[PDB]
Amino acid sequence: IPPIPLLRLDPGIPVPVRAHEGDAGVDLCTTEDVIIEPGERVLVGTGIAVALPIGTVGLIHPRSGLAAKAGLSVVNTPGTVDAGYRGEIKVCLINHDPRAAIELRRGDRIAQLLVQKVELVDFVEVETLDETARGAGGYG
Amino acid sequence: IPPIPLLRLDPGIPVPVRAHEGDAGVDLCTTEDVIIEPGERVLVGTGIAVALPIGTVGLIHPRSGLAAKAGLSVVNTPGTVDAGYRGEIKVCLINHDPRAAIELRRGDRIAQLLVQKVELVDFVEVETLDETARGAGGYG
Amino acid sequence: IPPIPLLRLDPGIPVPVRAHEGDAGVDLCTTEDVIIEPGERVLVGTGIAVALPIGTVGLIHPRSGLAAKAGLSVVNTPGTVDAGYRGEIKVCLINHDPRAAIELRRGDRIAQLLVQKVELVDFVEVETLDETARGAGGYG
Ligand SMILES: O=c1ccn([C@H]2C[C@H](O)[C@@H](COP(=O)(O)O)O2)c(=O)[nH]1
Ligand SMILES: O=c1ccn([C@H]2C[C@H](O)[C@@H](COP(=O)(O)O)O2)c(=O)[nH]1
Ligand SMILES: O=c1ccn([C@H]2C[C@H](O)[C@@H](COP(=O)(O)O)O2)c(=O)[nH]1
C-alpha cells in the first residue's frame, strides 16, 4: 500500500507510527499544554498535515485509556479528515468527567488516526424505494 | 459506482451533494427548528430516505464547525444506518456546551453522511484463540 | 467471508448474531448490573473475546434506541478493537442525560460491534504536499 505523504509542521512532534502490525490507528499528539475543566472543550493542533489519496478518509478516534480513566473524548468524533484537506490536523477535545479537570502537556498523545476507504457515491432521486424486512424500524 | 436511490420525503430539503470530489460525507439538514439547551438532546428528521446496497453502511458524523464552535454533537455517533433501512433518516443531536443554548432552523446543516463497506461476517465459537504480541492489553 | 473466531468468556452471555442480512453490527451485552447516574461513566465487560483478521478493525458504536431514549452513549466512541487484541471486549458507557439515571441489568444489550477493513499504511515525511481545491479550509 502506497505510504501517505506527511508534512511535519512542528519539529517537536514525532512522525506517527503504527505500534503493532495490525493496529487500526496511529497516535496523534497535542502541540500545546491545555487544562480542560469539567464539561469544557478545546481545539488543539497536532503538528501534522497529510495528503490522503482520493477514495480514502482519515478518522480521528478518542484514545481508549484516557476516555475510561479521565473522561477525555472528541466532540465531533469520529473526526472526519477529507482526502483533499491540506491543513494542519486539529482535534476538538472535551472533558466528560463531572469533577476532575484534565491537564495535557505538549507532546501528550490525545487521539488516534485511522485511514479507511470511503464510497464516493452520488444520490439519485427516485419516486419509490424497494421494500425490505427491516423496513422503517429505527430509533434515530 | 452505482448511485444510491434517494427518496425526498420533504420538498423543502435539498438533495444532498458532495462538496468536493474526494470529500467523505454529504450534508444532512434538520427538517425543523429546534432550540437545544445546554446538556439537552433532541431527535430531528432529515427529510430523506435511502436504499443503501447490501454490503454497505451509512454513517452519521457530527459537523466539525458546529462541534468546535457551539459544542453540537450526535449522541449515538457515529449514527449507524443499516442497508435494509427504508425509513426517514433521523439525527439525535446533543448540546455539549455548558452554558449557551444552540438554535437550529429548518434547513440548517446538522450532520454529515458517509457511505462505507462493512464486513457482513459470522462469529464462530472456538475453545481457544491464537496468540499475538498485543495480547490482552487494553483500556476498554 | 471467513467467520471470526469468538471465545465465550461468560456462559451467561449469548453468541452475538446479525439480526438482518445486511445489518452493519451485532449486539454486545453487559456482563454486570450497573446504575449510571447522570454525567457518570462506567467500564463494563461484554463476555467475549475475538480474533479479528489482520487488515480489519472492530468498531463499538452506541445503540440508537438507548441513545435517544435515555442519553446512553460510549465515551471513546467509536470504540476501536485492534486485530491483534485477544482480551475481553469492554465498553466504556456514559449517561448524557442531565437528570435520569440509567439502570442496566446483566444481559442487557449496550452497544453494537461492526467489522470493517482498515488501511494499514505508513506515513512518509515529505517537504511539501500537493495542492487541492479544498485547501486548508477546516474547523477541526
Ligand atoms: O443516527 C441514526 C441511527 C439509526 N437510524 C435508523 C437507521 C437504522 O438502521 C435504524 C437502526 O435502529 P435500531 O433498529 O437499531 O433501533 O435506525 C437513524 O435514522 N439515525
Ligand atoms: O471500546 C473499547 C476500546 C478498546 N478496547 C480494547 C481493544 C483494543 O485493541 C485495546 C486498545 O486499547 P489501548 O491499547 O489503545 O490501550 O482495548 C475495548 O475493549 N473496548
Ligand atoms: O476532527 C477534525 C475534523 C476535521 N478536520 C479538518 C479536516 C477536514 O476535511 C476539514 C473539514 O472541515 P469542514 O470543511 O467540514 O469545516 O477540517 C480536522 O482537522 N479535525
Author numbering:
A (entry chain A), B (entry chain A), C (entry chain A): 4 to 143
What did the article's authors report about this structure?
N. seriolae dUTPase (NsdUTPase) plays a key role in the proliferation of Nocardia, and was regarded as a potent drug target.
Then, we verified the detailed interactions between dUMP and NsdUTPase, the uracil group of dUMP formed hydrogen bonds with the main chain of Ile92 and Lys93 as well as the side chain of Asn79. The phosphate group of dUMP formed hydrogen bond with the side chain of Ser67. The active site of NsdUTPase was located in the surface, and consists of a series of hydrophobic interactions, which might be a promising binding pocket for ligand binding.
